[PDB]
Amino acid sequence: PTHADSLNNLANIKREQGNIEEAVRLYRKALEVFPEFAAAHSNLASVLQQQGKLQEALMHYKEAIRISPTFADAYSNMGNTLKEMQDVQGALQCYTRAIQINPAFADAHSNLASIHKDSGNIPEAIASYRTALKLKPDFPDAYCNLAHCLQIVCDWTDYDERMKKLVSIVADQLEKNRLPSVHPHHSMLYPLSHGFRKAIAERHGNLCLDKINVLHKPPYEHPKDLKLSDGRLRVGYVSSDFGNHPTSHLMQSIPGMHNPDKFEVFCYALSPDDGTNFRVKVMAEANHFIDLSQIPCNGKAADRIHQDGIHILVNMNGYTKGARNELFALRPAPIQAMWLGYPGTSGALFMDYIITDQETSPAEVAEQYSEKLAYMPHTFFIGDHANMFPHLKKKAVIDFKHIYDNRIVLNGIDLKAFLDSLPDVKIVKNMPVIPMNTIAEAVIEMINRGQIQITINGFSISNGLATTQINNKAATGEEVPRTIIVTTRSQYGLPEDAIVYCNFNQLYKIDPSTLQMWANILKRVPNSVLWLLRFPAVGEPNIQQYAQNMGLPQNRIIFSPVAPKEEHVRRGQLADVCLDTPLCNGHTTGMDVLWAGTPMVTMPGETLASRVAASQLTCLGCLELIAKNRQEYEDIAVKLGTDLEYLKKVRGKVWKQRISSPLFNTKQYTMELERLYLQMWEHYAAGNKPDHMIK
């Protein structure tokens, strides 16, 4: 009893010193002396949980709660452990019991809110976070988590004050040497200084170091040449998103496009096989594919990478879901680079480079990044659209009356043959146009009746809203559609006689300043609508209320459901102009709208995430779409919506250049990527530490 107290005390001490294993041994000794020690079980459990020994931690949490039925803190922490074991129902049960035992337990309410948040139930998450803050006004984790929920649904109540408080919270936590309550990925959304944003990321980098230092592994011996690999550079791509995810939608063709004479490609998957064609392709085309999801230990996984003799290890996650940055903290490779999947600095000394470009990351702002800049010659962004959606390379329209390029649209691999079977097809200078005859009436009839598909002259004509019922793999982008697809403004309730401005981003990317800008544009172009997505639906009423407050009637903004991947890209053809979000641009989303031939207006900011769209447009060759300030953004968007000849010119420009520019040219991109890798390697091989590669 008394002896057990001192043993538990000593363990706490050794724990603080960082001697985790001595702490464990001492906790166990305390239990050996006095088995019914609730605090000792809870302490050991917390330590085991920190080491990642979750099943073992669970044992001791269960002991603590039996010995002490009012031990709310233990139920709460046990819930945290179950959450990490991916037992969500279990975690919720624990948090629920914790709150029942002690209704004033602030942490338990916040923990419950996080379950609701991760489950997609934002309104319930908000309710629980507010309860936590009502119980404990000074609660940074809960305030910041609440702020992000509010962002997600476009609740901008007390917005300016909220932003000020977030910055204030971060400044205080950075001073007091604690992990900031704002996630580095979310830090792009708040008016934090570049210094603070880098500092937040650096804290996360140091977490990874802390976790691998306990492995006490020595620094790895790295290769000094390419002799053992027969002159080939061994490149390792590490991603949790080899499968159905935007990352693969952008880069799935790259591994197979590497030059085998000079490169040996290893893909390290952090996720299990999800059964999709995206995963199939990377596994089939990489020289080697290693499933690290089967190797939980970061030490063993890093050993595996080093065994392969990787020269350049590529971090495609940064601080995103499924990341295992501990692998990079262990430095199994001599050169480690951030690429594509994370729009910000890692802030981590174990990352050498970030692959970016001069437009996204001008050399003047290198101080925002901990990594050295490594420039691709055009943009660092890329997309697999030419391979995934080749049916959108060409289009035809149906004249249902002047001639419109975006009211009624057909696309298909066999579109040419179908057109060739029709009489009276006209070519507009090149866009094929079908007149308002029997063929065209039959198509519009299909759409109105909600019919799935029809047949004309033996050709399969599909309703664009019904792709999942015809071919689900084609709907998700896993397969190219094998039918001719119809897409119409009437499918989405869009006006036939007006300008359509679109933005297909998640609503969290919008802020008050942005919506006001959009309202200014709509007011200046009376014959126009703004087209947004229910992303999520619960954001819709907030946007509508704010628009109504700005003087816009409900009919000026049209919402559509989120669509399967192929339909989302295809329906971009119906818009006239995309209005990009300046706070955080469309990234994947930007590539999607440009592939449909839609001009995108953007205003690059200072953060990487706010500059991507401008980089894409610069590569594309449309400098006139890039605004230097809010007034110019409005003037550009209004010009496109009112000067109809100008609109035609720019749309024609986007339509042509998505093919002729490097933007969607995955072979060119890979070759430029290879050139950059070799610059990195030669620099290292000659005995130099990383330096900016900006020429």
Partner: peptide, 14 residues
């Protein structure tokens, strides 16, 4: 999307 799933870029747990 409703009836399916639309994966997005998401933060890791902390």
């Amino acid at each position: 999307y409703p009836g399916g799933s639309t994966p997005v870029s998401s933060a890791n747990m902390m």
